[PDB]
């Protein structure tokens, strides 16, 4: 008998203001210029 | 007997204001210019 | 009998203001120029 | 002056024979039973 | 002047035979039973 | 003047035979039972 629950995973937990660049959460491969 | 529940996954949990760039949550391959 | 719960994983837990570069949370492979 | 080219991303690069289960390349959310 | 090229990312580079379980390349969130 | 090239990233570089469990390459969050 197992029980798994209430795990929680966040990437950005607050405000993201006045951005002008490249804000990525998860990136597999690929290039980014900024 | 197993029980899995209430897992939770967020990428952006708050406001995203006045953006001017590239805000991506998950990116597989691909280029980004900003 | 096992019980796993309430684990929590964050990448950015506060404000992200006036960005002008490359803010990435998790990056597998891939190049970044900034 | 920038130049980005010839990036390449593969998920399965060879034969996939006699399968009987769940072969997924990329999975966001969702359950799999096998 | 920059130049980025010929990056390469693979997940499975050979044969996948007689499978009976859950073969996933990339999985964000979500449960797997096997 | 920069030059970046020929990077290479593999997860499984050979045969995967007679599987009966959960073979994952990259897993963000999420549970696995096997």
Curated annotation (Swiss-Prot), chains A, B, C, D, E, F:
Q: What is known to happen upon mutating residue 27 to L?
A: Reduced lipid peroxidation inhibition
Q: Where is this site: Implicated in free radical propagation?
A: 25
Query: Which chain positions carry the site (Susceptible to oxidation)?
Result: 27
Intracellular or extracellular location(s) = Cell surface
| Residues reported in the UniProt entry to bind Zn(2+) 2 | 2, 5-6
Q: What is the effect of changing residue 34 to V?
A: In one chronic schizophrenia patient; uncertain significance
- Region (Interaction with PSEN1), start-end ranges: 16-34
For Cu(2+) 2, which residues are the binding ones? 2, 5-6
Q: Where is this site: Cleavage?
A: 8-9, 11-12, 32-33
The reported effect of residue 27 to V is: No free radical production. No hippocampal neuron toxicity
The source's superkingdom equals: Eukaryota
The residues that the database entry marks as glycosylated are 2
Q: What does this protein do?
A: More effective reductant than amyloid-beta protein 40. May activate mononuclear phagocytes in the brain and elicit inflammatory responses.
Describe the subunit structure. Answer: Interacts with FPR2.
Write the protein's name: Amyloid-beta protein 42
